PDB file of C-alpha atoms and ligand atoms in Angstrom:
ATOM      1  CA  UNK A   9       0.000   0.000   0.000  1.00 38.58           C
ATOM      2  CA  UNK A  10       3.360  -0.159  -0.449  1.00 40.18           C
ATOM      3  CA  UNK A  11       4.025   0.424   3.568  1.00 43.74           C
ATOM      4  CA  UNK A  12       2.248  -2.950   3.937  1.00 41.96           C
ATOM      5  CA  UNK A  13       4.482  -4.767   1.879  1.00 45.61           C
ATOM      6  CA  UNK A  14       7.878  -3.085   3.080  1.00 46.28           C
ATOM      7  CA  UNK A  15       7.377  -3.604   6.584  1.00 50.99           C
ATOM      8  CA  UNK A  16       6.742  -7.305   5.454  1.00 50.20           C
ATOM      9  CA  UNK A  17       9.452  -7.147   3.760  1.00 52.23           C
ATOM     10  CA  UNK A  18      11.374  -5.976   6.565  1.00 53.60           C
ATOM     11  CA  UNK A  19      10.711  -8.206   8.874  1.00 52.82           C
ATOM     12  CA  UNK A  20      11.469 -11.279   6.404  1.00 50.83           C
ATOM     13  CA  UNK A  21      14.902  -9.854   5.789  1.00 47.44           C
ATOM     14  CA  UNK A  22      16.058  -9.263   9.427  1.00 49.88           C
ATOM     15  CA  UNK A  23      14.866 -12.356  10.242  1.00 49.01           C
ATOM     16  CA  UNK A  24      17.288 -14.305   7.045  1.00 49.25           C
ATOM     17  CA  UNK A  25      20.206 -11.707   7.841  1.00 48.66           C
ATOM     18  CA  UNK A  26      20.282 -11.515  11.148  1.00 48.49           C
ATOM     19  CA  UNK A  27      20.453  -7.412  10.943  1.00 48.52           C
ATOM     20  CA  UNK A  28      19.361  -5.724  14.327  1.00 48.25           C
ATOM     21  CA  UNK A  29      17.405  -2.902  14.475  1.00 51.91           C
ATOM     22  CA  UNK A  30      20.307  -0.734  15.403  1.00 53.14           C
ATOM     23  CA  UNK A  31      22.707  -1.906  12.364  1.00 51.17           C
ATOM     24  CA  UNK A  32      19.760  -1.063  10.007  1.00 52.62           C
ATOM     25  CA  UNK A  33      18.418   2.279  11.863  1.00 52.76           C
ATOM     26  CA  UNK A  34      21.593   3.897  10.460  1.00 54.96           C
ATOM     27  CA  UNK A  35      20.032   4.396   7.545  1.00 54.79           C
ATOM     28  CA  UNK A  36      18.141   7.065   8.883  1.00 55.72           C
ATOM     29  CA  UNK A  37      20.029  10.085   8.646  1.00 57.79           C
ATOM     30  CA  UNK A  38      20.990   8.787   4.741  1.00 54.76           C
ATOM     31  CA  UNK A  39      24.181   6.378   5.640  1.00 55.33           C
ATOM     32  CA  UNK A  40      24.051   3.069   3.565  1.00 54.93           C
ATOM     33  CA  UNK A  41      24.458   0.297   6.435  1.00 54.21           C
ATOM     34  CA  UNK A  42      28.144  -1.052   6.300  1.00 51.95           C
ATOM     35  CA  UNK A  43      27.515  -4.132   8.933  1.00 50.48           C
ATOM     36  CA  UNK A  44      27.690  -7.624   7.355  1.00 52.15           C
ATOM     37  CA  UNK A  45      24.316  -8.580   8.401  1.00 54.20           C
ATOM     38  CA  UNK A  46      22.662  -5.493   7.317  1.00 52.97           C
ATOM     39  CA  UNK A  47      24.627  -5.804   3.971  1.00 52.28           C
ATOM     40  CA  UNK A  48      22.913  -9.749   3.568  1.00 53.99           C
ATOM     41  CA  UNK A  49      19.328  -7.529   4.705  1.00 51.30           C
ATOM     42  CA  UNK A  50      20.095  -5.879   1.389  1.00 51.92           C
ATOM     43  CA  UNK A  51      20.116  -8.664  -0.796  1.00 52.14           C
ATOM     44  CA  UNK A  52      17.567 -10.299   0.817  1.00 51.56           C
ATOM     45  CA  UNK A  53      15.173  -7.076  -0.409  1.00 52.70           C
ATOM     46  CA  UNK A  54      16.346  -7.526  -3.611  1.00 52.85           C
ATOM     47  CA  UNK A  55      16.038 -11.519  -3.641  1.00 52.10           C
ATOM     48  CA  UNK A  56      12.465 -11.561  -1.936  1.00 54.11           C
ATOM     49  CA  UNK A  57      11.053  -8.759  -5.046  1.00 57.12           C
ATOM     50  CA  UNK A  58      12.851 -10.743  -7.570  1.00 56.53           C
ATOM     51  CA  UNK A  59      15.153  -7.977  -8.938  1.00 57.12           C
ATOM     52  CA  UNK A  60      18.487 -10.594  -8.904  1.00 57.96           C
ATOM     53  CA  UNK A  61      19.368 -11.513 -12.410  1.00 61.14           C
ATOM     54  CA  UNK A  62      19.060 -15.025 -12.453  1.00 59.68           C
ATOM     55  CA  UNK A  63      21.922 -15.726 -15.450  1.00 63.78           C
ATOM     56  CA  UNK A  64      24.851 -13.025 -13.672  1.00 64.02           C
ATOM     57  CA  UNK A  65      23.844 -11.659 -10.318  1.00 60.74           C
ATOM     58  CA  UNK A  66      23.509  -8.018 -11.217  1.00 64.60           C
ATOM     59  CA  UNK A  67      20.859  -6.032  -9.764  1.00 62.03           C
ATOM     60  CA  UNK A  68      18.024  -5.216 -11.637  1.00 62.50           C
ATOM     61  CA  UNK A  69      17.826  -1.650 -10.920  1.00 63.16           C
ATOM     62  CA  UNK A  70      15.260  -0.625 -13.449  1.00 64.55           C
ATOM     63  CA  UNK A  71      12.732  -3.208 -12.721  1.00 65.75           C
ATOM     64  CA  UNK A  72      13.072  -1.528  -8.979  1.00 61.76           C
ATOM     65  CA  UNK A  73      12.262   1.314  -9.409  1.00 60.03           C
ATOM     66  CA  UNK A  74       9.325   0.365 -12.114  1.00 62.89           C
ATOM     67  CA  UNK A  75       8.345  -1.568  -8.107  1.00 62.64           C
ATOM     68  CA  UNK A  76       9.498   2.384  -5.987  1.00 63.24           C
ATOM     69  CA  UNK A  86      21.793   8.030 -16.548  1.00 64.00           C
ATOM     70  CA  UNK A  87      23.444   5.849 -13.761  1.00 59.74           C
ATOM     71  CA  UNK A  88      21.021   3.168 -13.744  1.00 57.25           C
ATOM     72  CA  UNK A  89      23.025   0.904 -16.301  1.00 57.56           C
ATOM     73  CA  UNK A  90      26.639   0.779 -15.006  1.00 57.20           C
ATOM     74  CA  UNK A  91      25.225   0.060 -11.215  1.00 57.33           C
ATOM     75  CA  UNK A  92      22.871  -2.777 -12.354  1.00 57.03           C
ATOM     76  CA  UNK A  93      26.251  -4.451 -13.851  1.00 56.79           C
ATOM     77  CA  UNK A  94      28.135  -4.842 -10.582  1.00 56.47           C
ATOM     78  CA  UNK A  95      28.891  -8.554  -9.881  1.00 57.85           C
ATOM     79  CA  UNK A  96      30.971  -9.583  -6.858  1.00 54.02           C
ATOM     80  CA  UNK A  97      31.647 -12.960  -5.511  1.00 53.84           C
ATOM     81  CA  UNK A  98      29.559 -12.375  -2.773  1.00 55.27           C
ATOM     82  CA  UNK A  99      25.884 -11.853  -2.949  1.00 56.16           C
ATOM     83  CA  UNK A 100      25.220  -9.042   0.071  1.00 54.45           C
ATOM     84  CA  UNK A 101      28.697  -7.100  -1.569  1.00 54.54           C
ATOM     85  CA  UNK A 102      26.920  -7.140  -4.477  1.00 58.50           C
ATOM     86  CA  UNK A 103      23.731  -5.771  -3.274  1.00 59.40           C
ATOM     87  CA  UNK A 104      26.046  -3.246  -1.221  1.00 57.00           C
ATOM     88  CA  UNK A 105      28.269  -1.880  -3.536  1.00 56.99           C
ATOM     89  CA  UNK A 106      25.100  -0.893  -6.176  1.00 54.48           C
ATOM     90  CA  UNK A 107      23.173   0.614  -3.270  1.00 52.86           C
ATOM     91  CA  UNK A 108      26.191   2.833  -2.665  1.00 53.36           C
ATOM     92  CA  UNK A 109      26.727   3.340  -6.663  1.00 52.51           C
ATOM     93  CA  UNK A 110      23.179   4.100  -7.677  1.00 52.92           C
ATOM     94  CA  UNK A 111      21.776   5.462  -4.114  1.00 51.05           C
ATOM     95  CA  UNK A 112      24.586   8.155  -3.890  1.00 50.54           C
ATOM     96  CA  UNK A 113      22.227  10.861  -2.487  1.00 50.87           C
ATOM     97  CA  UNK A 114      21.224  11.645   1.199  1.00 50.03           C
ATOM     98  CA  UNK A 115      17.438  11.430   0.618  1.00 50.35           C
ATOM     99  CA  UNK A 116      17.505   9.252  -1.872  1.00 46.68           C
ATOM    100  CA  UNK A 117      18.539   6.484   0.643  1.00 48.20           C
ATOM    101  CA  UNK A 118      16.153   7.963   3.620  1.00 46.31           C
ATOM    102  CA  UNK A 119      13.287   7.440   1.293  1.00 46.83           C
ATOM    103  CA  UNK A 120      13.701   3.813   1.344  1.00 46.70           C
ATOM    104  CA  UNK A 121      14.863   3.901   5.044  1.00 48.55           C
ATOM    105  CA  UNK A 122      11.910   5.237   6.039  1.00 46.84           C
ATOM    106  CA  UNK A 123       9.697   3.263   3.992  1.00 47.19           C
ATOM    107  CA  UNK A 124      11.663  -0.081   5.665  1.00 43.72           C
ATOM    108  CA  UNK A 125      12.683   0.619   9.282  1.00 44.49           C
ATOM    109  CA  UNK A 126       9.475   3.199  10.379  1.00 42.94           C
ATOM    110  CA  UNK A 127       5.896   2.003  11.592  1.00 44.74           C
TER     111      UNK A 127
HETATM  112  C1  PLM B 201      18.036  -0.126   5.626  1.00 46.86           C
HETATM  113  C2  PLM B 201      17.394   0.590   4.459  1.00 46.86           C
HETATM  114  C3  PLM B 201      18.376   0.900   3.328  1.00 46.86           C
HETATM  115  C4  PLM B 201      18.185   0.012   2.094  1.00 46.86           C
HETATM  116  C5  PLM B 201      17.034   0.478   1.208  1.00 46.86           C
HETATM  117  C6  PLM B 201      17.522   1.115  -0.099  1.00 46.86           C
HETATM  118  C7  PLM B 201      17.697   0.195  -1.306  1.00 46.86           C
HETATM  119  C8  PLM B 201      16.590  -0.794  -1.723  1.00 46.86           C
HETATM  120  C9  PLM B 201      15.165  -0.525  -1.255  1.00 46.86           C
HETATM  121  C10 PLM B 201      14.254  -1.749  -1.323  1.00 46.86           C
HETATM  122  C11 PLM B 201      12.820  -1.300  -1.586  1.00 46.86           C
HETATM  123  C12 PLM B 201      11.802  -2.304  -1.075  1.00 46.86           C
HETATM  124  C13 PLM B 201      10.384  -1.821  -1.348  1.00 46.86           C
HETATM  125  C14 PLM B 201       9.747  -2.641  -2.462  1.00 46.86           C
HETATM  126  C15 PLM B 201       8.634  -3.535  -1.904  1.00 46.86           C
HETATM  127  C16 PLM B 201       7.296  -3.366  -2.584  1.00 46.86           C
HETATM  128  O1  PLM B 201       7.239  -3.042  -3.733  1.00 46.86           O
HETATM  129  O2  PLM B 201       6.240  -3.533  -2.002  1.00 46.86           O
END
């Protein structure tokens, strides 16, 4: 409603990660969460709405946002581990302050 959903989401995702609360909160003042379990909560979003590509790994970018310029070169970033991955094109594509508190808010807040 798409709060509904999120918070579902959210709860999923900390549960499969392991992220507290805390490690995630710091997304709140537009800081990308750096802690290992909040980096697996990451790609657990992107796993659970099906924007993984199934044949590489890269991030679907486009068909996330279609869900709510730079787009291309940050949904081709493959590492050899799955919550870098989701990470590192986060930080490319998400490289604003509000940009990331959007999403933060929609996640971590009641
Ligand atoms: C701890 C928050 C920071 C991470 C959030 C920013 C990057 C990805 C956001 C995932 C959006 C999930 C909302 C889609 C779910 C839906 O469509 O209902």
């Amino acid at each position: 409603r798409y709060k509904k959903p999120a918070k579902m989401l959210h709860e999923i995702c900390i549960a499969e990660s392991g992220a507290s609360e805390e490690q995630l909160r710091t997304c709140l003042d537009g800081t990308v969460p750096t802690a290992p379990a909040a980096k697996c909560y990451i790609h657990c979003l992107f796993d659970k709405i099906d924007v993984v590509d199934e044949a590489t790994g890269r991030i679907l970018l486009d068909r996330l946002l279609y869900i709510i310029h730079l787009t291309r070169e940050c949904s081709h970033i493959v590492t050899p581990d799955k919550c870098e991955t989701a990470y590192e094109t986060v930080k490319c594509y998400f490289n604003a302050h509000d940009e990331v508190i959007k999403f933060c808010h929609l996640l971590v807040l009641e």
